[PDB]
Amino acid sequence: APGTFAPLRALRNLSLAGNRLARLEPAALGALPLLRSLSLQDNELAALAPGLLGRLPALDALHLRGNPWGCGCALRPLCAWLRRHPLPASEAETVLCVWPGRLTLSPLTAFSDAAFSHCAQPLALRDLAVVYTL
Amino acid sequence: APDCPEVCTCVPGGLASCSALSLPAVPPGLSLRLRALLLDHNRVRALPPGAFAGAGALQRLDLRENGLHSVHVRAFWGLGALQLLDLSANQLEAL
């Protein structure tokens, strides 16, 4: 439920491993500026909602092993964090893609921005003029 | 040694046993040096895709009496050296 962790301002460790959480929402976890680490392993988190990462300024540790990560643009807030917060090689070998067939167990740390240049870029001002005037 | 799970029991030669430990999921930190893995009599109801990643050189996998009812298509990716599978005594209704 949203706002459940809202009165818990002084959190440092919040563990949610081995659960059946389909989706984690930024409104559910709320504002946790003092939070330093999170554990979401062995869960069914397909993707993280945009803006979830923005409410955790001091977050430095993240565990994402054993999750059905669908490696598309939906994990753009996630991978950018992993670039700035490099996981250990043992952990990096366990955080993998899951989306099936052609894509499989590809490491998330190996995906760079250029490999997803087709993803939705933020609205510019030149393109904003062109789409109106075309 | 780092190649052995913290909760499981390992012997030289790559043999690891994790049974009778009430594991709710696959133990983390699999290594390439383990050749035979035991996981029976646990409570691993759901098997995440790529759960057995890292132990690509494993040869025998046991999952008997572990409450299995749904297995992902890519859960066994990269287990090309795996030879023995014991999925019996579970509740798998469809593959």
UniProtKB/Swiss-Prot annotation, chain B:
It is found in: Cell membrane; Cytoplasm, Cytoskeleton. Disulfide bonds join 4-10, 8-18. Residues 1-32 form the LRRNT domain. LRR repeats lie at residues 33-54, 57-78, 81-95. It comes from the Eukaryota. Auxiliary protein of the large-conductance, voltage and calcium-activated potassium channel (BK alpha). Required for the conversion of BK alpha channels from a high-voltage to a low-voltage activated channel type in non-excitable cells. These are characterized by negative membrane voltages and constant low levels of calcium. This is Leucine-rich repeat-containing protein 26. It comes from Homo sapiens (Human). The lineage of its organism: Eukaryota, Metazoa, Chordata, Craniata, Vertebrata. The gene is LRRC26.
